Amino acid sequence: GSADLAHGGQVFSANCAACHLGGRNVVNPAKTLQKADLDQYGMASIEAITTQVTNGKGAMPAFGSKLSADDIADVASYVLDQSEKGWQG
Amino acid sequence: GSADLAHGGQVFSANCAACHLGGRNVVNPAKTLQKADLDQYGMASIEAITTQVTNGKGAMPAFGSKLSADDIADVASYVLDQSEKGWQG
Numbered sequence: 354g355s356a357d358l359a360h361g362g363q364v365f366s367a368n369c370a371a372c373h374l375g376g377r378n379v380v381n382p383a384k385t386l387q388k389a390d391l392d393q394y395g396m397a398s399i400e401a402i403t404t405q406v407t408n409g410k411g412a413m414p415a416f417g418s419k420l421s422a423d424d425i426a427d428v429a430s431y432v433l434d435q436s437e438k439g440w441q442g
Numbered sequence: 443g444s445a446d447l448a449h450g451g452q453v454f455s456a457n458c459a460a461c462h463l464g465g466r467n468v469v470n471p472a473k474t475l476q477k478a479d480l481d482q483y484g485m486a487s488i489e490a491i492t493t494q495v496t497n498g499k500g501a502m503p504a505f506g507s508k509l510s511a512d513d514i515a516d517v518a519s520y521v522l523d524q525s526e527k528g529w530q531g
């Protein structure tokens with residue numbers, strides 16, 4: 354799949370930063386995008402992130418109608434990369 | 443439509459309070475459930491609220507498949523009532 358990290362960061366800024374700026378989670382600080390939280394909840398994979406972005410979960414909206422498959426693959430790759438590098442912001 | 447306020451408050455607690463506790467908006471503080479904001483954005487009517495709950499908007503998830511139409515009508519009635527009276531919490 355698509356794994357354009359820089360484009361993923363753009364998708365992230367346009368669609369995810371409202372709730373996950375800097376890798377946080379303003380709606381649920383127990384479920385951030387930080388490595389330990391992704392690991393805790395089985396979310397440290399492209400497949401898991403793609404599914405949740407596409408379909409939504411709980412208070413997280415779905416993005417499948419607004420974003421292309423490549424947009425979602427890119428943002429998933431961006432999230433996982435940032436979690437491995439330690440987020441900033 | 444259904445206008446069971448106390449049931450609407452239960453729907454609100456289970457589905458909306460993660461983001462709108464006390465009539466606020468943790469994601470976008472310019473778009474709270476306070477009367478002045480609902481009035482400003484044309485959201486101070488039952489159908490405006492039911493439509494946005496049903497379809498989602500921006501970072502707000504959709505609920506149209508997860509809640510019955512009466513649940514959505516009840517939560518809209520609760521939101522309007524609380525907004526007009528003044529929220530607590």
Ligand code: HEC
Pocket residue numbers: 365368369370371372373378380381383384385386387390391394396402405406410411412413414416428429432469501502503
């Ligand atoms: C606020 C309305 C959000 C938007 C915009 C985005 N996300 Fe989200 N995210 C939000 C919540 C409330 C949760 C927890 C959902 C639940 O009940 O389980 C999440 C969770 C995630 C996760 C998992 C994090 C973890 O388990 O620790 C990921 C990987 C994630 N969100 C990614 C993500 C993306 C890539 C977004 C933009 C397309 C995005 N989220 C937006 C709230 C919100």
Ligand code: HEC
Pocket residue numbers: 380412413414454457458459460461462467469470472473474475476479480483485491494495499500501502503505517518521
């Ligand atoms: C966090 C993930 C949210 C959940 C859960 C609920 N809402 Fe929401 N709401 C949220 C956002 C980010 C916004 C702004 C959307 C935009 O881009 O315009 C809203 C907005 C509303 C409004 C309008 C408020 C206003 O115009 O001032 C209403 C009436 C509203 N939300 C109601 C509502 C209901 C009843 C919910 C539970 C079913 C609900 N919201 C959940 C974020 C979130």
